[PDB]
Amino acid sequence: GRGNADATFTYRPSVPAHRRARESPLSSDAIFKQSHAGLFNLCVVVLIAVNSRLIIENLMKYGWLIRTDFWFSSRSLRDWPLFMCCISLSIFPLAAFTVEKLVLQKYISEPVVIFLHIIITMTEVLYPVYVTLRCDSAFLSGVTLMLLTCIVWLKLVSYAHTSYDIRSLANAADKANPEVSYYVSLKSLAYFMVAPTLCYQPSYPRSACIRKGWVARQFAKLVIFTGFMGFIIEQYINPIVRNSKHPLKGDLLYAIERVLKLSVPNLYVWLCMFYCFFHLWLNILAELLCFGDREFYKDWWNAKSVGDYWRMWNMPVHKWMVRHIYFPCLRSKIPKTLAIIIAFLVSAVFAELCIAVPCRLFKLWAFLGIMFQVPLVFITNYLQERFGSTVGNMIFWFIFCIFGQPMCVLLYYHDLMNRKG
Amino acid sequence: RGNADATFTYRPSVPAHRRARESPLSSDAIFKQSHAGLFNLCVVVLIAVNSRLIIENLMKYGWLIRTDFWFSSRSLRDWPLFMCCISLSIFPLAAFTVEKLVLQKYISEPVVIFLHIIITMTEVLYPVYVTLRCDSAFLSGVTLMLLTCIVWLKLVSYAHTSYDIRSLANAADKANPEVSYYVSLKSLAYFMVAPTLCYQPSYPRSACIRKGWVARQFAKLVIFTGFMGFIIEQYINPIVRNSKHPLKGDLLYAIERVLKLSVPNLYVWLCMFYCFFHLWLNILAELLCFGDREFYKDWWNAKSVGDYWRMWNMPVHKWMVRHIYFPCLRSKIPKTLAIIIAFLVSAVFAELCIAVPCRLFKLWAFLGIMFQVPLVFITNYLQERFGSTVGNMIFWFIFCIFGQPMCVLLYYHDLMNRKG
Ligand SMILES: CCCCCCCC/C=C\CCCCCCCC(=O)SCCNC(=O)CCNC(=O)[C@H](O)C(C)(C)COP(=O)(O)OP(=O)(O)OC[C@H]1O[C@@H](n2cnc3c(N)ncnc32)[C@H](O)[C@@H]1OP(=O)(O)O
Ligand SMILES: CCCCCCCC/C=C\CCCCCCCC(=O)OCC(COC(=O)CCCCCCC/C=C\CCCCCCCC)OC(=O)CCCCCCC/C=C\CCCCCCCC
Ligand SMILES: CC(C)(COP(=O)(O)OP(=O)(O)OC[C@H]1O[C@@H](n2cnc3c(N)ncnc32)[C@H](O)[C@@H]1OP(=O)(O)O)[C@@H](O)C(=O)NCCC(=O)NCCS
Ligand SMILES: CCCCCCCC/C=C\CCCCCCCC(=O)OC[C@H](CO)OC(=O)CCCCCCC/C=C\CCCCCCCC
Ligand SMILES: CCCCCCCC/C=C\CCCCCCCC(=O)OC[C@H](CO)OC(=O)CCCCCCC/C=C\CCCCCCCC
Ligand SMILES: CCCCCCCC/C=C\CCCCCCCC(=O)OC[C@H](CO)OC(=O)CCCCCCC/C=C\CCCCCCCC
Ligand SMILES: CCCCCCCC/C=C\CCCCCCCC(=O)OC[C@H](CO)OC(=O)CCCCCCC/C=C\CCCCCCCC
Ligand SMILES: CCCCCCCCCCCCCCCC(=O)OC[C@H](COP(=O)(O)O)OC(=O)CCCCCCCCCCCCCCC
Ligand SMILES: CCCCCCCCCCCCCCCC(=O)OC[C@H](COP(=O)(O)O)OC(=O)CCCCCCCCCCCCCCC
Ligand SMILES: CCCCCCCC/C=C\CCCCCCCC(=O)O
Ligand SMILES: CCCCCCCC/C=C\CCCCCCCC(=O)O
Ligand SMILES: CCCCCCCC/C=C\CCCCCCCC(=O)O
Ligand SMILES: CCCCCCCC/C=C\CCCCCCCC(=O)O
Numbered sequence: 091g092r093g094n095a096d097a098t099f100t101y102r103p104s105v106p107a108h109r110r111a112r113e114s115p116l117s118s119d120a121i122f123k124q125s126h127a128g129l130f131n132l133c134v135v136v137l138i139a140v141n142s143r144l145i146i147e148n149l150m151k152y153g154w155l156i157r158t159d160f161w162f163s164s165r166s167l168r169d170w171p172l173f174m175c176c177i178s179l180s181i182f183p184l185a186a187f188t189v190e191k192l193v194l195q196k197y198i199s200e201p202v203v204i205f206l207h208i209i210i211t212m213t214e215v216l217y218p219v220y221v222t223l224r225c226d227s228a229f230l231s232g233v234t235l236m237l238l239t240c241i242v243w244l245k246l247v248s249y250a251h252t253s254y255d256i257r258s259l260a261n262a263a264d265k266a267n268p269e270v271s272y273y274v275s276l277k278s279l280a281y282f283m284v285a286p287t288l289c290y291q292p293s294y295p296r297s298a299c300i301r302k303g304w305v306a307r308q309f310a311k312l313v314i315f316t317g318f319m320g321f322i323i324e325q326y327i328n329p330i331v332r333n334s335k336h337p338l339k340g341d342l343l344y345a346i347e348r349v350l351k352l353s354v355p356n357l358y359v360w361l362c363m364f365y366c367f368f369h370l371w372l373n374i375l376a377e378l379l380c381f382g383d384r385e386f387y388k389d390w391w392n393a394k395s396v397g398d399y400w401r402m403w404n405m406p407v408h409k410w411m412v413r414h415i416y417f418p419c420l421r422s423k424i425p426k427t428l429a430i431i432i433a434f435l436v437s438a439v440f441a442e443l444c445i446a447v448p449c450r451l452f453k454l455w456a457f458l459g460i461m462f463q464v465p466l467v468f469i470t471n472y473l474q475e476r477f478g479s480t481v482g483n484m485i486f487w488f489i490f491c492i493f494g495q496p497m498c499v500l501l502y503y504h505d506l507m508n509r510k511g
Numbered sequence: 512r513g514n515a516d517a518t519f520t521y522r523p524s525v526p527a528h529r530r531a532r533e534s535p536l537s538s539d540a541i542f543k544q545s546h547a548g549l550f551n552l553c554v555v556v557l558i559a560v561n562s563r564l565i566i567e568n569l570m571k572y573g574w575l576i577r578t579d580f581w582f583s584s585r586s587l588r589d590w591p592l593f594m595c596c597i598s599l600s601i602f603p604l605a606a607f608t609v610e611k612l613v614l615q616k617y618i619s620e621p622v623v624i625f626l627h628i629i630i631t632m633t634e635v636l637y638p639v640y641v642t643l644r645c646d647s648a649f650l651s652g653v654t655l656m657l658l659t660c661i662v663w664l665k666l667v668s669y670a671h672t673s674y675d676i677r678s679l680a681n682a683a684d685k686a687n688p689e690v691s692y693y694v695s696l697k698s699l700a701y702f703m704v705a706p707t708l709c710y711q712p713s714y715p716r717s718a719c720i721r722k723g724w725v726a727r728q729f730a731k732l733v734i735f736t737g738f739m740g741f742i743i744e745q746y747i748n749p750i751v752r753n754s755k756h757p758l759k760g761d762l763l764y765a766i767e768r769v770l771k772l773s774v775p776n777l778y779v780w781l782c783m784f785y786c787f788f789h790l791w792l793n794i795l796a797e798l799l800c801f802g803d804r805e806f807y808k809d810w811w812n813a814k815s816v817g818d819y820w821r822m823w824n825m826p827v828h829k830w831m832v833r834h835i836y837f838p839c840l841r842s843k844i845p846k847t848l849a850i851i852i853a854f855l856v857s858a859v860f861a862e863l864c865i866a867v868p869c870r871l872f873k874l875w876a877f878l879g880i881m882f883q884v885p886l887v888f889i890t891n892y893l894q895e896r897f898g899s900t901v902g903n904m905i906f907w908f909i910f911c912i913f914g915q916p917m918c919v920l921l922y923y924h925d926l927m928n929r930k931g
């Protein structure tokens with residue numbers, strides 16, 4: 091035919107076929123200086139075949155498990171006592187604003203301000219916890235209420251500390267510009283409480299305008315990916331978790347097989363959760379509010395260790411811990427390792443709150459898992475220095491996406507089922 | 512930052528937002544740097560999936576390895592076949608006798624083609640009758656039929672190359688070399704055991720024989736052959752035993768069985784290539800001091816099916832180019848019919864190798880080799896349309912996930928259907 095090789099002018103069989111002594115491939119170091127694209131294309135083809143076999147085997151065993159009443163039903167008893175609390179979480183920054191105005195005119199002293207701030211933040215933590223504990227609602231409503239409570243707590247602590255620092259620099263060094271209009275101050279606080287950031291500033295860099303078609307397109311992608319995530323949770327995660335036993339009570343091999351079976355759709359749900367929250371929703375929120383800065387994350391998938399992942403997975407939380415926990419501890423002559431223990435302790439307490447308060451279980455799995463990250467940072471740093479970056483990134487994937495999250499899902503689900511009966 | 516080290520402390524009055532930036536996935540300037548974490552994620556998911564398959568098979572079945580699966584009461588199969596493998600040696604000596612009988616001007620030139628036809632058909636038909644008469648295992652008859660194909664390719668190559676040298680020497684009318692009978696017999700004897708299919712009076716030679724190198728390659732050959740036996744016994748056998756015919760049951764069940772079987776089948780095929788085409792041929796070339804050792808190329812980077820067929824097996828490719836392609840081109844046969852002739856020879860010999868030990872007459876392997884001609888024409892077009900990556904992926908999907916497990920299931924269930 092056409093031919094993608096040497097020309098077709100005939101040489102006779104009396105002409106020899108062997109004239110030079112060569113050497114076979116994979117028997118010399120010259121094979122390493124060549125691109126082997128097919129060896130990764132083979133892995134991609136094997137992955138597609140494996141996932142296709144899993145889909146066909148799950149469909150043959152179970153069938154269509156999708157129901158119209160699984161996610162959103164007519165049980166609206168969960169809605170009204172907690173969503174009202176969601177609106178009732180907006181009275182705590184205004185109270186804080188009143189305290190700040192009380193120190194702006196010379197009416198009260200500084201320790202009274204710190205004591206009042208502790209009262210407002212503590213009441214803000216304790217009241218939704220009591221509301222969620224007294225009622226009986228779904229998991230999702232409680233998770234949403236706890237996440238909003240944690241975000242409002244971080245904003246209040248950041249606003250109070252940054253306002254004290256601005257007041258302390260404006261009173262000590264040089265006194266200028268006294269008594270700025272209450273409406274501009276209320277507008278800045280109200281703008282900060284809805285913006286996609288956790289650090290308070292009086293003003294922020296802005297963008298051009300609102301692109302309505304862009305916001306509509308990102309919203310359409312967000313609803314499609316959320317529906318895809320719900321389908322993967324209902325059709326694939328639910329059979330595996332119903333058909334298991336407790337991992338700490340039973341055979342070891344059976345528990346390892348259940349964790350390895352749960353590892354793949356959990357990883358898919360994790361990537362979809364990151365793309366839905368940290369990319370789509372924050373950009374839609376920034377576009378509506380004309381928020382200029384949009385560095386909400388970095389390339390965390392190229393992490394060379396556990397500490398690399400914790401440095402680049404979440405930009406607002408990392409900037410909040412650097413500004414409000416790490417640097418005040420460093421200024422007070424405390425060592426570095428104590429600062430990493432205090433920061434991970436704050437993270438472990440709030441993660442334990444968000445997971446355990448809807449579940450109504452005092453099992454400290456999530457607390458121990460966040461608190462175990464402190465020796466893991468040093469161990470993966472030593473391993474990455476000794477062995478390289480590829481082996482460090484593989485150790486990070488094995489620890490995070492293969493072992494930890496399915497084990498947490500199985501422990502919390504089975505503890506909840508043992509609580510109910 | 513990088514490892515563990517602090518930074519001086521700033522203050523919260525300093526703003527943390529001073530520039531208006533965009534997200535990493537909001538721009539097309541994201542592929543400039545290396546995203547090595549995705550490749551590592553694919554490797555980690557593959558290792559986890561393989562470990563789950565090993566643990567699930569071990570929990571379901573247990574240890575299935577037996578001490579008498581391969582070598583147990585083999586004297587009924589070893590005595591007639593291995594003797595027939597020694598009996599194949601008289602077929603070069605006949606052809607050599609015919610060459611000497613035309614070299615001394617005792618018989619004419621049309622008689623030698625007829626005599627070569629009698630020698631080649633007798634050499635093919637005698638092991639077929641010996642394999643079909645006395646009952647034996649599959650692995651003892653596969654070896655005999657593969658030596659029946661290799662000795663037929665060497666005899667056809669020797670006859671054609673000898674005729675071409677004689678036809679060249681006839682038109683010159685001068686003969687200064689005078690090769691003795693011992694030297695010609697030594698050349699033919701060296702050709703029959705060398706790792707090549709193309710006849711030459713002499714070849715480039717190697718320096719010497721390295722004993723430690725031969726011992727190391729032989730040790731690797733024993734370890735990898737044992738690994739192949741363990742994969743076939745422990746994993747391929749329970750999948751193949753608990754299944755049905757692919758055109759008898761439900762379609763979803765058949766697709767699930769082929770996709771289940773396709774993962775250890777790939778390991779057996781790559782291990783088979785590494786054991787034969789790399790280890791054994793180099794050991795044979797080292798013991799025989801054979802210089803040329805390019806027995807293959809990098810076929811795993813092929814962008815189409817025709818690319819794979821061009822670089823999977825160097826002796827068979829040189830034999831098809833020298834003995835089937837260029838004589839067809841010299842005789843004004845069209846270029847699209849020589850491909851059909853070459854694939855026809857390969858399909859007949861492949862169908863013979865799978866069907867004579869199995870004792871079945873079903874053309875699964877024959878039609879599979881003969882379907883590669885429209886596959887070559889389609890994949891060249893898809894390669895030109897969509898690129899080398901898509902072409903290589905189509906090659907991997909067609910060969911490793913669909914063709915070979917379906918062929919294994921069809922031949923097994925047809926064999927079990929015959930035996931009852
Ligand atoms: C719609 C799809 C649906 C799904 C799919 C359904 C069907 C699936 C079916 C099945 C899947 C599985 C398939 C098998 C898997 C296992 C394989 C094994 O390893 S098992 C061992 C058994 N195999 C054998 O017994 C064969 C042995 N035969 C050969 O290896 C030969 O080499 C053969 C017949 C393949 C001939 O091919 P050449 O490439 O070696 O040689 P030439 O035909 O002479 O030339 C081809 C090309 O060579 C170049 N060429 C031409 N002249 C050249 C020259 N002088 N020098 C170099 N190259 C030259 C040109 O590119 C030419 O192109 P131009 O085909 O005409 O388009
Ligand atoms: C809601 C409204 C909020 C607005 C608030 C106002 C301003 C915002 C303010 C400030 C900026 C915010 C940033 C600050 C903090 C936030 C980040 C945060 O806190 O969490 C984020 C995320 C994280 O979840 C994870 O699990 C990942 C954790 C990482 C892995 C950890 C585990 C592994 C560890 C160890 C391994 C174990 C090894 C041990 C030993 C081994 C042996 C050695 O959770 C979600 O929220 C995702 C939810 C899922 C997606 C739902 C849909 C998403 C779309 C929309 C929702 C709204 C749509 C409205 C549409 C209306 C019309 C329809
Ligand atoms: C706590 C968190 C900030 C991680 O950071 P951390 O290591 O604990 O503490 P810091 O942010 O103060 O320091 C991070 C690193 O940056 C380094 N660093 C120091 N100064 C820095 C600076 N100016 N900028 C950036 N990094 C800096 C630190 O040395 C540290 O490396 P180290 O850990 O070896 O000390 C945060 O990303 C986190 O872990 N959150 C968890 C939230 C969570 O678990 N929620 C539930 C999930 S389901
Ligand atoms: C990333 C790699 C995988 C991507 C490839 C996905 C395609 C592979 C193929 C095939 C499925 C083949 C079966 C076709 C469906 C009809 C079978 C039938 O006639 O039976 C009747 C029965 C009666 O009920 O069913 C139905 O009507 C059909 C309902 C089921 C459709 C589900 C399709 C969703 C597929 C993929 C989702 C993507 C996420 C992957 C998650 C993987 C987790 C393990
Ligand atoms: C650390 C990185 C590797 C990541 C792979 C995931 C490993 C998960 C599994 C298992 C460890 C199992 C060994 C613990 C033994 C104690 C359990 C017990 O008490 O009972 C023993 C039981 C008798 O009842 O069984 C046995 O005696 C031996 C069990 C053998 C199973 C080993 C298979 C899984 C481990 C590794 C596979 C790695 C190869 C993958 C290569 C793929 C390349 C693409
Ligand atoms: C005894 C007198 C008779 C006359 C002389 C006999 C010698 C004739 C032959 C041969 C030397 C071979 C030279 C030709 C090179 C081209 C080979 C070829 O073109 O054939 C390719 C083949 C079929 O197409 O491709 C395959 O896939 C084969 C897959 C087999 C993999 C099985 C793993 C074990 C590998 C090798 C056997 C172990 C060595 C023996 C050691 C044990 C000693 C008792
Ligand atoms: C002169 C000597 C010749 C040497 C020839 C052979 C050398 C290499 C050989 C063989 C295979 C051995 C590898 C396994 C190690 C022995 C296991 C053992 O100690 O004895 C079994 C014991 C009772 O005796 O207990 C058990 O059964 C539990 C252990 C089973 C472990 C299986 C590990 C499989 C590893 C990789 C397979 C990768 C393929 C995955 C494909 C999945 C597709 C479905
Ligand atoms: C009991 C928990 C309290 C939670 C927080 C309460 C509200 C905080 C509001 C702060 C407002 C400014 C106050 C005065 C600032 C000052 O004098 O000056 C600023 C100082 C540090 O002074 P320097 O900057 O001079 O070193 O800030 C701090 O000491 C803390 C800053 C805010 C971060 C609080 C984080 C809370 C969680 C702590 C770890 C976990 C709990 C540990 C105990 C069990
Ligand atoms: C149109 C249909 C053609 C046949 C199709 C089926 C072919 C099956 C495979 C066998 C033939 C392979 C090629 C052999 C010929 C060649 O290389 O070459 C055939 C040659 C080529 O001559 P040129 O080089 O001058 O073109 O034709 C000749 O007349 C020269 C004399 C050759 C004498 C020795 C031939 C080989 C002897 C042993 C095998 C005999 C035939 C067995 C047939 C079953
Ligand atoms: C079904 C009870 C809750 C199960 C645990 C859920 C834990 C939170 C994780 C993901 C839930 C949010 C993403 C999926 C929502 C899909 C909604 C929908 O498809 O309509
Ligand atoms: C409403 C009736 C059914 C209730 C049980 C629903 C299933 C609960 C089981 C598992 C939920 C898993 C939630 C998502 C896990 C991934 C989270 C992550 O990766 O961070
Ligand atoms: C023999 C050892 C048994 C170990 C039992 C406990 C295993 C670890 C359980 C949970 C680890 C933490 C889970 C992931 C981090 C916390 C939860 C989260 O934020 O998603
Ligand atoms: C009202 C209860 C109905 C039944 C339970 C439905 C809720 C599912 C609850 C817990 C499952 C998941 C908890 C563990 C989450 C860990 C997140 C992660 O994987 O990182």
Ligand SMILES: CCCCCCCC/C=C\CCCCCCCC(=O)O
Pocket residue numbers: 576581736737738739740741743
């Ligand atoms: C069709 C395949 C071609 C032939 C390949 C098989 C060769 C068989 C020879 C030896 C296999 C021995 C199997 C050893 C199993 C593992 C033993 C062990 O683990 O102790």
Ligand SMILES: CCCCCCCC/C=C\CCCCCCCC(=O)O
Pocket residue numbers: 743747748751776777779780915919923
């Ligand atoms: C029936 C006797 C006992 C069972 C013996 C084994 C049965 C399995 C049958 C066929 C599987 C052959 C596996 C290897 C074939 C080559 C794979 C390949 O070409 O890629």
Ligand SMILES: CCCCCCCC/C=C\CCCCCCCC(=O)O
Pocket residue numbers: 653654657660661857860861864865
């Ligand atoms: C010692 C050799 C072992 C070989 C094991 C092979 C397993 C598969 C069995 C039969 C497939 C035969 C394929 C024949 C290919 C072409 C033969 C040829 O033309 O030389």
Ligand SMILES: CCCCCCCC/C=C\CCCCCCCC(=O)O
Pocket residue numbers: 861865875876878879880914915917918
């Ligand atoms: C899409 C369904 C198509 C069904 C087709 C059924 C026909 C099966 C024919 C060929 C299958 C594979 C045979 C080729 C592999 C050859 C192996 C070898 O040469 O040794």
Ligand SMILES: CCCCCCCC/C=C\CCCCCCCC(=O)O
Pocket residue numbers: 647648649865869914915916918919922923926
């Ligand atoms: C008494 C002996 C009974 C039979 C022994 C075991 C036979 C296994 C043989 C045949 C099944 C097919 C083998 C592989 C052929 C297809 C090769 C391929 O597709 O590449």
